[PDB]
């Protein structure tokens, strides 16, 4: 500080979630005050993974993959030109993992 | 990522006056480059330390330590940006050392440390110290990065840490699988001090064959605070099959700290 | 708009970390992966860790790779701030980048 706001050239320019052994559901996150305005959040379908038969495998763990990402938020609100940079944690998808087991 | 305390952090030492300010990992020297940049840090080392919060809980902390290079660029060294990057999520956390005074001589070698970055078990980070101002475009690097790999809760010192304990590192279920009269199995275990549910997975196999001839999942609803540390035995009936004798029974906790991904506990019953 | 005003005083909205979470899955996954550091001194964020799947197939129970299944990457289109030359203004560009954040095991069609 003093704050350094800058001039940015806006040079901007579909599956698996159903087919995975750890399938997930995508949830629409809309915000007109944000860019990207619409962003999809994954939430794992089950606690276990899925076996060949389609039933939930209780011996495996359906677990989320998250990421810290950048977004632009209109500052002041509704501004067409000015925005502020924001960090946000987001779930992108799910993976199937082998659980940690201790034997006796 | 987090710092263990929001206490008045100090970076000052004899010969040098500095305050540790926090930073957005996007430094003002990158937005606005300067022609005269300091040289790179030297001998970056990150060690696993353990610390206590002003409250009482113990956390695994990253101990970052580096030294300065002997060149005259020291005069132009304004401070340093300390950065922790978790690799799984691409989460970044920064703290900045702001030199309020100017370092002129090298008479005695300048050494720095920072031990406030809380780190998690069985995790890999990328810790980096970036001398400030950062370089001009296409300039020589002036920073040093090292990957830090934190051990799992099985580690001697680690299991006595707050995140580990909360995921039941010190929980000992005295699992006792008992073979009973007429195709019945009684499985007893002592539950932990958390109001989260549990599961029992019984998988039967033939003697010396890794194919399940019978499988059953049993639910244990979240217990009352009075029910904590008390025993919960459940009697489950097996499949009728002369041959399907090897029983593998495992307990799955669902502690807030780990949810589905908690450490499970297996026990096996034999045959003749 | 072609050109915008961006305040780089990054507002951190990633603060609700209250209940405990996270572990390293790249080795424990049925679609295991390897980590690759993607650094660019000229863009924010400078370093991004991407995943590259280990196998075309997935690791079975016995631990061997099953090719009747597929390790596939979980890609994510991400915003990046790139600092320009200097020469050819503007000073910064805002770009969309494809990144592999992890792997998943899928049933083929
Ligand atoms: C959840 O449980 C854990 C572990 O539970 C303990 O072990 C199991 C097997 C059962 O036997 C339980 O009944 C036990 O509680 C809890 O962690 C332990 O917490 C106790 C009490 O806080 C700790 O015991 C002793 O710690 C220090 C060691 O230096 C002693 O000085 C303490 O004594 C003082 O405080 C007492 C209580 O205030 C008081 O009565 C005494 O007169 C004395 O002034 C204390 O006895 C133990 O060390 C902890 N375990 C570890 C390895 O840190 C945990 O607190 C529970 N959590 C929740 C949320 O319920
Ligand atoms: C960013 O920093 C402020 C200030 O905290 C301390 O002082 C700075 C000079 C620097 O040394 C920091 O690393 C220190 O941690 C943080 O604000 C504090 O927040 C806590 C509650 O979260 C509050 O109890 C304190 O009184 C605050 N201190 C002041 C002086 O405002 C702020 O949380 C830091 N941000 C993050 C996310 O770490
Ligand atoms: C580091 O620099 C600080 C700057 O001093 C400031 O101005 C004087 C007049 C006082 O009002 C002081 O409180 C201000 O902070 C000083 O604290 C001091 O010189 C140095 N601090 C230490 C701990 O060495």
Curated annotation (Swiss-Prot), chain B:
Glycans are attached at residues 17, 22, 35, 174, 193, 210, 233. It comes from Homo sapiens (Human). Disulfide bonds join 11-18, 25-94, 153-164, 213-244, 245-271, 258-262. The chain holds residues 33 to 304 of 866 of the full protein. Widely expressed. The gene is IL17RA. This is Interleukin-17 receptor A. Receptor for IL17A and IL17F, major effector cytokines of innate and adaptive immune system involved in antimicrobial host defense and maintenance of tissue integrity. Receptor for IL17A. Receptor for IL17F. Binds to IL17A with higher affinity than to IL17F. Binds IL17A and IL17F homodimers as part of a heterodimeric complex with IL17RC. Also binds heterodimers formed by IL17A and IL17F as part of a heterodimeric complex with IL17RC. Residues 1-272 are extracellular. Forms heterodimers with IL17RC; the heterodimer binds IL17A and IL17F homodimers as well as the heterodimer formed by IL17A and IL17F. Forms complexes with 2:1 binding stoichiometry: two receptor chains for one interleukin molecule. IL17A homodimer preferentially drives the formation of IL17RA-IL17RC heterodimeric receptor complex, whereas IL17F homodimer forms predominantly complexes with IL17RC homodimer. (Microbial infection) Interacts with SARS coronavirus-2/SARS-CoV-2 virus protein ORF8. Glycosylated. It is linked to Immunodeficiency 51: A primary immunodeficiency disorder with altered immune responses and impaired clearance of fungal infections, selective against Candida. It is characterized by persistent and/or recurrent infections of the skin, nails and mucous membranes caused by organisms of the genus Candida, mainly Candida albicans.
Curated annotation (Swiss-Prot), chain C:
The keyword Secreted applies. Induction: Induced upon differentiation of CD4-positive T cells. Up-regulated by IL23A-IL12B. Up-regulated in peripheral blood mononuclear cells upon West Nile virus infection. It is found in: Secreted. The keyword Secreted applies. Its main location: secreted. GO terms for cellular component: external side of plasma membrane; extracellular region; extracellular space. Keywords: Adaptive immunity, Cytokine, Disulfide bond, Glycoprotein, Immunity, Inflammatory response, Innate immunity, Secreted, Signal. Changing residue 37 to V: Decreases the affinity for IL17RA by 5-fold. N-glycosylated. Found both in glycosylated and nonglycosylated forms. One of its GO terms (molecular function) is cytokine activity. Homodimer. Forms complexes with IL17RA and IL17RC receptors with 2:1 binding stoichiometry: two receptor chains for one interleukin molecule. IL17A homodimer preferentially drives the formation of IL17RA-IL17RC heterodimeric receptor complex. IL17A homodimer adopts an asymmetrical ternary structure with one IL17RA molecule, allowing for high affinity interactions of one IL17A monomer with one IL17RA molecule (via D1 and D2 domains), while disfavoring binding of a second IL17RA molecule on the other IL17A monomer. Heterodimer with IL17F. Belongs to the IL-17 family. This is Interleukin-17A. The chain holds residues 42 to 150 of 155 of the full protein.
